[PDB]
Structure 1
Amino acid sequence: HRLSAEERDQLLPNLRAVGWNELEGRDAIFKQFHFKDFNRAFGFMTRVALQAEKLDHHPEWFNVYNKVHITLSTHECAGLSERDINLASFIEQVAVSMT
């Protein structure tokens, strides 16, 4: 679970490669996505929310018009678990659908 140094290192990169940062202050990983419009920003949030239940691992996000900032980090192990590694991979896999 609660990412080991050992793990967390090797999982983190690709995420790291795309904008996903570690948060100073908590064991979390954030990222803001800036779409082209609302229809997209929300088309995005949807497939993602359709997928946060599927897993029963929900994000911390915030949309305005076309930017959403997503913060991931497990409540169960008060940390970054593989759980959100997955979810983020999926999150990424979705934005790419959107422009």
Structure 2
Amino acid sequence: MDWEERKRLVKTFAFPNFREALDFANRVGALAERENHHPRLTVEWGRVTVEWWTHSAGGVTEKDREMARLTDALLQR
């Protein structure tokens, strides 16, 4: 599945367990630290939901889309 504007940019990533989901969340966290823009991450067994938005703007901005693309890049598909 690709990113969707739900006002936030959201995508869920599937994993075989909790451990791998948490591992991915940590990589997204490192990315957030580097770009000075943080997501809302939801980690549970087999899934990580990543949400990007800009509070001040009350929605999705170019920075959020950049973070979404950098998040997908972490998968190196």
TMscore range, shorter length = 0.7 to 0.9
Secondary structure class of the residue paired with 1:70: strand
Give the TM-score, by structure 2 length.
0.84
TM-score by length of 1: 0.68
Measured after TM superposition, the shift of residue 76 of structure 1 is 2.8
**Which residue in the other structure is 1:87 paired with?**
67
Tell me if 1:21 matches 2:4. Answer: yes
The Cα shift of 1:38 comes to 2.4
1:55 maps onto 2:35 in alignment: yes
RMSD: 1.8
Q: Which runs of 5 or more residues in structure 1 are unaligned?
A: 1-17
Larger Rg: 1
**Aligned-residue offset at 1:97:** 4.7
Identity of matched residues, % = 29
Displacement after TM superposition at 1:19 (Å): 2.0
Q: Structure 2, unaligned stretches of length 5 or more?
A: none
